[PDB]
Design an enzyme around this catalytic site. Structure first.
Site, PDB file in Angstrom:
ATOM      1  CD  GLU A 212      -2.891   1.111   2.462  1.00  7.21           C
ATOM      2  OE1 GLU A 212      -3.019   0.030   3.108  1.00  7.21           O
ATOM      3  OE2 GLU A 212      -3.533   2.135   2.758  1.00  7.21           O
ATOM      4  CG  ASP A 214      -1.677   4.737   2.793  1.00  3.69           C
ATOM      5  OD1 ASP A 214      -2.560   4.276   2.042  1.00  3.69           O
ATOM      6  OD2 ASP A 214      -1.343   4.190   3.866  1.00  3.69           O
ATOM      7  CD  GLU A 217      -4.108   7.280   4.694  1.00  2.00           C
ATOM      8  OE1 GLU A 217      -5.354   7.361   4.675  1.00  2.00           O
ATOM      9  OE2 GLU A 217      -3.494   6.215   4.946  1.00  2.00           O
ATOM     10  CG  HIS A 228       1.237   0.786   4.890  1.00  2.00           C
ATOM     11  ND1 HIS A 228       1.049   0.567   6.237  1.00  2.00           N
ATOM     12  CD2 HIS A 228       0.638   1.973   4.619  1.00  2.00           C
ATOM     13  CE1 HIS A 228       0.390   1.588   6.762  1.00  2.00           C
ATOM     14  NE2 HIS A 228       0.121   2.451   5.799  1.00  2.00           N
TER      15      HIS A 228
END
Ligand code: NAG
Ligand code: NAG
Ligand code: NAG
Length: 434
Positions: A212, A214, A217, A228
């Protein structure tokens, strides 16, 4: 899952720009599709629900196999049920949409065509988008991110998934989510338990893990970027404690890093860079551009644009690290000062580079947080600490902000707008839009 057609599925269109190093950008025509979990699941041959409230039909769905046989996903009325609308290069997601029922938030994927998610190879390239977070208070998260999903949403891998990417199947992320109603072509009925605080959600026996990225956010108060890694790069089923993440004896017992190496400028000590009004460098009452560059070494550079001014990611100082590039030294220093070894344990940036070297699918979503009230993003977390513990303060939101019932009730008309997506080699997205 199979698909039924009481609601024919037509994806809202979205243009974006693909750019070349030779100095040009040209228009791409994509579209967005809502994740399977937001869809009505009913009997293949009638209007009877197989999933209703937060529990499955005991008659229709006694086990995974019978449920998948008896049931089907249907289409989405994007605007009228889900508050999802597009216009040119712009996508808006409303928070609470009241139709015959109440819908809260959405998770959407960018498509290449009717049956295929758009895959981006990020490594050595850059991703730029515009965002308006002005309508996002504490507790909300308008997220833009990337996951290692299969382009066909799992059709070629799982014979009983005939719905595919057309119906938003195949989700995975670094939380190894067990709240998914379909994973690997099958219903997640076995071991399903309804949420104690959410009337619409629950947790199954199985989950779905992958890498992942990101990118974003964020709300009007706080923003973070987080990487991640997982030990298996792409989508994989997990079972129970095998999933790690939120639900498991061992949060860290699964194949993925649930914490990630994050960069939140506020958490890092710059409290005037990003916030509402003219006292911040980036004024969140107004649209901003966010650009993310994936250095071939595996490091990450970030800049922002607002009102025609380009702002670099602010320099941070942490342990032995000083600078503004998310690299190995930053992520090591973050663990050294803030604690934890999850990121490193799962192979760090080297492992994460394996994800960015392949295809990843673009996700745009709007959500509140039934687990932690978004406090990990915009407030003090865990809540027993003050700014005495390094890393504890991530934003200026009160520790009693972000309760889902409260924000769903007070800010139903909150919304996020993502627009002007542009992708190409590093240095190329500043080029003239096509
Ligand atoms: C959509 O793209 C997929 C993936 O390559 C391809 O197999 C399929 O034929 C495409 N469909 C159309 C209608 O172009
Ligand atoms: C459902 O159960 C079967 C057999 O018990 C299992 O193999 C399968 O992976 C499960 N699927 C999901 C989505 O939970
Ligand atoms: C925060 O970042 C801004 C913009 O780069 C910079 O001008 C300012 O000096 C930084 N503040 C701190 C406390 O580092």
């Amino acid at each position: 899952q199979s698909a039924c057609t009481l609601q024919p599925e037509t994806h809202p269109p979205l243009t974006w720009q693909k750019c070349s190093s030779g100095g040009t950008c040209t228009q791409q025509t994509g579209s967005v599709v809502i994740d399977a979990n937001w869809r009505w699941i009913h009997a293949t041959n009638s209007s009877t629900s197989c999933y209703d409230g937060n529990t499955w039909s005991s008659t229709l769905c006694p086990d995974n196999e019978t449920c998948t046989k008896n049931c089907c996903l249907d289409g989405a009325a994007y605007a009228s049920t889900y508050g999802v609308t597009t216009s040119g290069d712009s996508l808006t997601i409303g928070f609470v949409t009241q139709s015959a029922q109440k819908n809260v938030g959405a998770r959407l994927y960018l498509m290449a065509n009717d049956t295929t998610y758009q895959e981006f190879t990020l490594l050595g390239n850059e991703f730029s988008f515009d965002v308006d977070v002005s309508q996002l208070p504490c507790g909300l998260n308008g997220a833009l991110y990337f996951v290692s999903m299969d382009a066909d949403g799992g059709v070629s891998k799982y014979p009983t998934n005939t719905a595919g990417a057309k119906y938003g199947t195949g989700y995975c992320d670094s939380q190894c989510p067990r709240d998914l109603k379909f994973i690997n072509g099958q219903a997640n009925v076995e071991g399903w338990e309804p949420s104690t605080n959410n009337a619409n959600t629950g947790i199954g026996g199985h989950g779905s893990c992958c890498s992942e990225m990101d990118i974003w956010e964020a709300n009007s108060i706080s923003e973070a970027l987080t990487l991640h890694p997982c030990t298996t790069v792409g989508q994989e089923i997990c079972e129970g404690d095998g999933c790690g993440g939120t639900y498991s004896k061992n949060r860290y017992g699964g194949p993925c890093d649930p914490d990630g190496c994050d960069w939140n400028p506020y958490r890092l000590g710059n409290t005037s860079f990003y916030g509402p009004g003219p006292s911040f460098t980036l004024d969140t009452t107004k649209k901003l551009t966010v650009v993310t560059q994936f250095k071939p070494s595996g490091a990450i550079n970030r800049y922002y644009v607002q009102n025609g001014v380009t702002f670099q990611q602010p320099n941070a100082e942490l342990g032995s690290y000083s600078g503004n590039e998310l690299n190995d030294d930053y992520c090591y220093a973050e663990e050294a000062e803030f604690g934890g070894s999850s990121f490193s344990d799962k192979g760090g940036l080297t492992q994460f580079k394996k994800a960015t070297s392949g295809g990843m699918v673009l996700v745009m979503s709007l959500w509140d947080d039934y687990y932690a009230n978004m406090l990990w993003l915009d407030s003090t977390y865990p809540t027993n600490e003050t700014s005495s513990t390094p890393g504890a303060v991530r934003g200026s939101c009160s520790t009693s902000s972000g309760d889902p019932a409260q924000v769903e009730s007070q800010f139903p008309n909150a919304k996020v707008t993502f627009s002007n997506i542009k992708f190409g080699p590093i240095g190329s997205t500043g080029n003239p839009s096509g």
